[PDB]
Design goal:
Chain lengths: 481, 277
């Protein structure tokens, strides 16, 4: 009748995740996600010089540290009254934009591609499920392998681009309250542009085409994994110095309807989370982190964030859906050639196909393409030699919030400063929105709900369970912190 | 090909990402010919209890002969429940359990990253999880398996591949036993290889003259003066960043901003505030 399947560790994601699903008549009919590892950055940050935060918060997650760095300095800029020079804003975008490219490339090839591509007879590519449902021709499988290897060079080059104005990566030194620590010189801009060109080539010629092509051999995967079909974007990549227009404009989508994003509507629930019951339902500005690992009923160190009581998902899909940009020229051609679809903007594909397992991989590939244009824009806008930082004094009393989009979705950092020290620091991260447990009202998290209906016609090889999860690109370091 | 199991406790996966940045000419050979990376949750094909069972089967077949890479600290509070790394036979496996199971039967343990080496950020002021350095945990539990620390937050990939290579050479010359004896001959009192951590950043810093002159940059973007007043921790830090630099030689912390002493046992607390002398 009903079979429970627990997968711990879910692999080929970042961090510690357990998935437990119930399977009835060949489908997932229930799901619970557990983030199994906790560090407690929100309490570790208490009492430090607020400038230290932009270093500490990066160790939340070594795959997306520039997202945390960015959110933190934006929070500190606000709290310190610091006016980031124009050239510093652009430099920051160059540092952070380069890791979007690394992160999406890492995710598709090095995390996700083994879900569809058979690796060779060497560890860690073997052993695996005897019935792994790997459907690609010898030729397309070989392209998959060839590109996973090439991608190892490309993603490393991305990190080289990050380090040029960033200092090193993981964990940039180059972003601080007040802007960026190093003025781009003509020479180093030549170096960033030369590497960006090789990345651009790979994304256009290899990555976007392979996601569509592999996608075309797994069309059933566009029909499952919808969940709530509700999305959040909080905005990212300031495009002028006045905080108005952004590369990704904020918005919420739910039940077929677009609405504005109002961060006061965010509450984090803890009934099913290992935190003290009296801390449930707080906005981040009043957020508290009191761990309760023995609490009865709870099953995760991830809190449950709700927007106006809604369970929402985040990430490239959510951003591309909210913003609805033009599809890339590769996507447009491949949609036509391989799927028989003529589309012009992202939403032309329809809610059902966009919010599906494979739709999320396609949204990530498209967003990567969309990021090339933004970076090329910043490379034109940047001015060699122009100052990129101001040096503000630490205030005795202040508060600040930084909102941005991490490669995996919406991120914000709130800081409260008192006696020139951190009094409260709260983080609401991307994978916190996606991989969270039930809220106090028993409503499931986005990935939990997206698991409902996933096919498992063979309980001994239940491959689609981790496949659905991996389409969200989870990082539980971010989710839990 | 001896197996390697890569276990993550309280880490941020940054030690795996830094390794993926390696340009070391030996790295592909290490992974394809030298060892077999049999368990690594971020990159391996299999999952869950299947992955765990595979690790356990290989551990048994290679008892005494496999190597453990540990990334992240080990939290001991609340009976190990702040880090659960898997489940098999209906039993959650904490990082505490995993180290007590695999620790005794490994040939050696590489604690990669300042977390595993020394506690690092998860152990810093305000933390509540009992996060513990690998070597201390193993000792507290009477496990005598040798440990080498490769610290840094994250380490330079060449420090990781570098230590494997110097370990590989020591074993080829003298066996598993003679080999390991020779590697202690190059570890400092903090258990780290003196080839990478034997030299002080500040004594080898290109801005040393400015430091001696008393010329201090007042803003991060002034690349002419010493970074000391901006918070540079170079004077108290032992690493070769000044020479090899980071990410294919394109930059390093002191050129770009300041050194935060990421390789040192007191990181981060003893290095904080980061942006004041
Ligand atoms: C998807 C699977 C990718 C497999 C890549 C194999 C890397 C080893 C190459 C040996 C030649
Ligand atoms: C961390 C996971 C270990 C894998 C490191 C792979 C580096 C590949 C280098 C190819 C050149
Ligand atoms: C993936 C890097 C892990 C390195 C583990 C130590 C290598 C020891 C090699 C001994 C061969 C004889
Ligand atoms: S304080 Fe830092 S920048 Fe100054 S000479 Fe020493 S290591 Fe170099
Ligand atoms: S320069 Fe200092 S902070 Fe940067 S990697 Fe080296 S030791 Fe760590
Ligand atoms: N990308 C990313 Fe990290 C996550 N989830 C953040 O925020
Ligand atoms: Cl990022
Ligand atoms: Fe949080
Ligand atoms: Ni992350």
């Amino acid at each position: 009748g009903r079979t429970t399947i627990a997968i711990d560790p879910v692999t080929r994601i970042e961090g510690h995740l357990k998935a437990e699903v119930v399977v009835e008549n060949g489908k997932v009919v229930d799901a619970r996600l557990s983030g199994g590892m906790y560090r407690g950055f929100e309490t570790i940050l208490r009492g430090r010089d607020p400038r230290d935060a932009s270093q500490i918060v990066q160790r939340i997650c070594g795959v997306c540290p520039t997202a945390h760095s960015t959110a933190s300095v934006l929070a500190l800029d606000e709290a310190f009254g610091a006016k980031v020079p124009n050239n510093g804003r652009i430099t920051r975008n160059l540092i952070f934009g380069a890791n979007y490219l690394q992160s999406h490339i890492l995710h598709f090839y090095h995390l996700s591609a083994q879900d569809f591509v058979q690796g060779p007879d060497t560890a860690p590519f073997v052993p695996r499920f005897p019935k792994s449902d790997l459907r690609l021709s010898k030729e397309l499988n070989k392209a998959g392998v060839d590109q996973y290897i090439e991608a190892l060079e490309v993603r490393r080059i991305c990190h080289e681009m990050v380090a040029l104005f960033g200092g090193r990566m993981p964990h940039v030194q180059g972003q601080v309250v007040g802007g960026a620590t190093e003025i781009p010189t003509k020479e180093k801009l030549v170096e960033y542009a030369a590497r960006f060109k090789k990345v651009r080539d790979f994304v256009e010629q290899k990555y976007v085409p392979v996601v569509y092509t592999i996608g075309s051999k797994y069309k059933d995967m566009f029909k499952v994994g919808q969940g709530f079909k509700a999305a959040l974007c909080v905005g990212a990549f300031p495009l002028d110095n006045s905080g108005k227009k952004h590369l990704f404009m904020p918005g919420v989508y739910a039940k077929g309807k677009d609405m504005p994003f109002d961060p006061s509507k965010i509450k984090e629930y803890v009934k099913y989370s290992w935190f003290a019951e009296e801390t449930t339902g707080l906005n981040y500005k009043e957020g508290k982190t009191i761990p309760a690992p023995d609490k009865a009923g709870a099953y995760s160190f991830v809190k449950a964030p709700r927007y106006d009581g809604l369970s929402l998902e985040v990430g490239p899909l959510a951003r591309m859906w909210v913003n609805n940009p033009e599809l890339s020229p590769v996507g447009k051609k491949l949609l036509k050639d391989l799927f028989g679809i003529s589309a012009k903007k992202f939403r032309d594909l329809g809610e059902e196909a966009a919010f599906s397992l494979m739709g999320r991989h396609v949204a990530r590939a498209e967003e990567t393409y969309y990021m090339l244009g933004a970076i090329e824009g910043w490379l034109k806008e940047i001015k060699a030699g122009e100052d990129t930082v101001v040096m503000p004094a630490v205030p005795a009393s202040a508060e600040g919030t930084g909102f941005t989009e991490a490669p995996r979705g919406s991120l914000l950092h709130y800081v409260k400063v008192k006696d020139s020290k951190i009094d409260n620091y709260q983080i609401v991260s991307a994978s916190l929105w996606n991989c969270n447990p039930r809220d106090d009202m028993g409503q499931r998290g986005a990935v939990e709900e997206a698991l409902i209906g996933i096919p498992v016609d063979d309980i001994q090889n239940p491959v689609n369970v981790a496949r659905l999860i991996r389409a969200f690109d989870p990082x539980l370091g971010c989710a839990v912190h | 090909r001896p197996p390697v199991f890569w276990l993550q406790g309280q880490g941020c996966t940054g030690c795996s990402v830094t390794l993926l940045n390696s340009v070391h000419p030996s790295i592909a050979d290490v992974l394809l010919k030298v060892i077999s990376l049999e368990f690594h949750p971020t990159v391996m094909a299999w999952e869950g209890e299947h992955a765990i069972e595979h690790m356990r089967k290989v551990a048994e077949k290679f008892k005494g002969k496999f190597f453990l890479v540990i990334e992240g600290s080990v939290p001991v509070e609340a009976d190990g429940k702040y880090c659960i790394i898997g489940e098999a036979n209906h039993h959650e496996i904490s990082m505490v359990d995993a180290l007590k199971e695999f620790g005794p039967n490994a040939a050696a343990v590489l604690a990669v990253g300042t977390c595993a080496a020394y506690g690092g950020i998860p152990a810093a002021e305000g933390s509540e999880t009992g996060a513990t350095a690998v070597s201390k945990f193993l000792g507290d539990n009477g496990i005598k398996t040798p440990v080498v620390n490769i610290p840094g937050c994250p380490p330079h990939p060449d420090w990781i591949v570098g230590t494997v290579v110097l370990a590989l050479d020591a074993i080829k010359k003298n066996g598993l036993e003679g080999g390991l004896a020779e590697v202690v001959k190059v570890l400092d009192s903090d258990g780290r290889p003196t080839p990478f951590f034997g030299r002080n950043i500040h004594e080898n810093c290109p801005y040393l003259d400015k430091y001696d002159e008393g010329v201090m940059s007042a803003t991060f973007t002034d690349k002419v003066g010493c970074r000391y007043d901006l918070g540079c921790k170079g004077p108290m830090t032992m690493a070769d960043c000044f020479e090899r630099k980071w990410n294919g030689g394109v930059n390093w912390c002191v050129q770009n901003a300041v050194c935060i002493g990421c390789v040192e046992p007191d990181f981060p607390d003893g290095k904080s505030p980061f942006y004041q002398a």
